[PDB]
């Protein structure tokens, strides 16, 4: 009887959302449906384009039901407030959405409450202004959850999906595979933060006050995460956006998606995570996440930059190009904060910078660099990361690089933190080495035969080549 | 330095309405003055305009219904950061 999706997000050990308010920007809703009655407030903010009643509130009623519905909702408690920015045909405007986001912020300023989650179950093309408005609202301290989009395409080409600081959610089905329906399906790529159930999701039907219907979409998926986030914020009202994101990632089911469903170049960029509620089991823990930059593009002096959130520390920095035409990467300071920068080679199509960004309070971190010598540098403190860059066209708390390369060590003073290094090598397109259960991968690199790059996937260090050796630095309290 | 942007998916564009985004610290009073100035400069050129909304609280700026002919003029207004043509969003 438990809907498959609600079972899917239930942790392996288990026992909400009322201190939290969830805003919904959508079609009109049937607020008298028994799933949501008395739990959703209709603001009557409305900004929708002209067309070109049961059907009118179908989309919105279902999602309000996914988030907070008493029988089939994720966060059965939760309070919701609804804004109408989609018309009866489900169409809205960027300007209308902006006006809506502004309305939420004015409400907050006029009558402050607790943590806010804003669900944006909608998409248009890439919009500079819409992305900026989302970012600005995130920086004001509001959590935004958005749909990845339903076009079986790169989510970075859509808004608010591509919008920095917003949690972007793709949809997976009952077999934990990405939803695909012909030429349509879940979006994917590096702008997607995680996936959640978004096929065959039962919820409130606006046909009648007690009816139910199954719907599919990245909106349904985003609604699961809004519910999950609302529960997480009730339990821990002080979470920063970076902390909430690290928890959503940490508690997801990992490596459950068959990545063959995604286009080849998007596999590496797309996180293999299906959202789930935190367990009853939760003492301090080291949380890290992998942040891929935008591709640098092909200019000769091109650089890709991957950054961490203000409250995170950059513990390592790696890079990757599909061609292998790469000048490596370096950790460089910037506004008093370290970023991961990767360098394209002359004739390269471009490269990615790949940061490992971690929540490490009490950390004092620095970088130690040595110019081309092989080349070596050490933390003379724990080593959390090695990087290397070169300027040539071709070839023990210690990092070792190629003789023609500069080498950079990320060194932190973090008492109460233990780190070890685990190595693995073979004759090979991909070599792999994982931290032990309960350890957090902080750094991933290849021993210095021609590598495309290296990256952490959860707690597994992956090295890609064309005698290769993967090296993982793993830490815990 | 002010730039123009419109949706790359041509069918999703909504020409004739523009979001005028002003520089970050621009004050509401200035946003309003800038909108009126646009309306005046347009009117002297024979163009009707309508200010649909003035933005403040996240981004400063305004929403304006006008011919795209006026975009060169509008990009030269004081405080302008960029202008974006309105476009469609959809239930997912």
């Amino acid at each position: 009887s438990i809907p498959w999706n609600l079972e899917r997000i239930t942790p392996p050990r288990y026992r909400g959302g009322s201190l939290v308010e969830v805003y919904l920007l959508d079609t009109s809703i049937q607020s008298d449906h028994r799933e949501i009655e008395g739990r959703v407030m209709v603001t009557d903010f409305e900004n929708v384009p002209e067309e070109d009643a049961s059907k009118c509130d179908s989309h919105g009623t279902h999602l309000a039901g996914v988030v907070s519905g008493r029988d089939a909702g994720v966060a059965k408690g939760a309070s919701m407030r609804s804004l109408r920015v989609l018309n009866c045909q489900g169409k809205g405007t960027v300007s209308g959405t902006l006006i809506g986001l502004e309305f939420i912020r004015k409400s907050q300023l006029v009558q402050p409450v607790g943590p806010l989650v804003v669900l944006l179950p909608l998409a248009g093309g890439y919009s500079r202004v819409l992305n900026a408005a989302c970012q600005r609202l995130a920086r004001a301290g509001v959590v935004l959850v958005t749909a990845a989009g339903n076009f079986r395409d790169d989510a970075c080409l859509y808004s608010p999906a591509s919008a920095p600081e917003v949690i972007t959610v793709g949809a997976t089905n009952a077999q934990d595979q990405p939803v695909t329906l012909g030429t349509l399906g879940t979006n994917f790529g590096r702008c997607v933060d995680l996936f959640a159930p978004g096929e065959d999701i039962i919820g409130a039907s606006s046909d009648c006050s007690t009816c139910f219907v199954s719907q599919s979409g990245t909106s349904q998926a985003a609604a699961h995460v809004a519910g999950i986030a609302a529960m997480m914020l009730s339990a821990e009202p002080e979470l920063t956006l970076a902390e909430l994101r690290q928890r959503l990632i940490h508690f997801s089911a990992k490596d459950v998606i068959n990545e063959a469903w995604f286009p080849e170049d998007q596999r590496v960029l797309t996180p293999n995570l299906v959202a789930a509620l935190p367990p009853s089991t939760h003492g301090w823990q080291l949380f890290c996440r992998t942040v891929w930059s935008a591709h640098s593009g092909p200019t000769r002096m091109a650089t890709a930059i991957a950054r961490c959130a203000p409250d995170e520390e950059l513990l390592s920095c790696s890079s990757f190009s599909r061609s292998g035409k790469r000048r490596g990467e370096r950790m460089e300071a910037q506004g008093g904060k370290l970023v991961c920068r990767a360098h394209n080679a002359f004739g390269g199509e471009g490269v990615y910078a790949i940061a490992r960004c971690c929540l490490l309070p009490q950390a004092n971190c620095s970088v130690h660099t040595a110019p081309p010598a092989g080349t070596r540098v050490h933390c003379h403190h724990v080593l959390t990361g090695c990087s290397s860059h070169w300027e040539v066209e071709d070839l023990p708390n210690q990092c070792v690089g190629h003789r023609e390369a500069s080498i950079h060590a990320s060194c932190c003073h973090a008492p109460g933190l233990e780190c070890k290094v685990k190595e693995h090598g073979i004759p090979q397109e991909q070599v792999t080495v994982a931290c032990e259960e309960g350890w957090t991968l902080t750094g991933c690199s290849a021993l210095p035969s021609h590598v495309l790059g290296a990256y952490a996937v959860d707690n597994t260090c992956v090295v890609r080549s064309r005698a290769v050796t993967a090296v993982a630095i793993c830490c815990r309290s | 330095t002010a730039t123009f942007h419109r949706c790359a998916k041509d069918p999703w564009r909504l020409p004739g309405t523009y979001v005028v985004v002003l520089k970050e610290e621009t004050h509401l009073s200035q946003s309003e003055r800038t909108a009126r100035r646009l309306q005046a400069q347009a009117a002297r050129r024979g163009y009707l305009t309508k200010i649909l909304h003035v933005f403040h609280g996240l981004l400063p700026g305004f929403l304006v219904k006008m011919s795209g002919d006026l975009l060169e003029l509008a990009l030269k207004l004081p405080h302008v950061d960029y202008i974006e043509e309105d476009s469609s969003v959809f239930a997912q």
Binding site: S58, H59, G90, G149, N150, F151, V179, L181, G182, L184, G185, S214, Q215, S216, G217 | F90, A91, Q92
Partner: peptide
């Protein structure tokens, strides 16, 4: 691609 993938 609105309403369960235009389904």
């Amino acid at each position: 691609x609105l309403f369960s993938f235009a389904g």
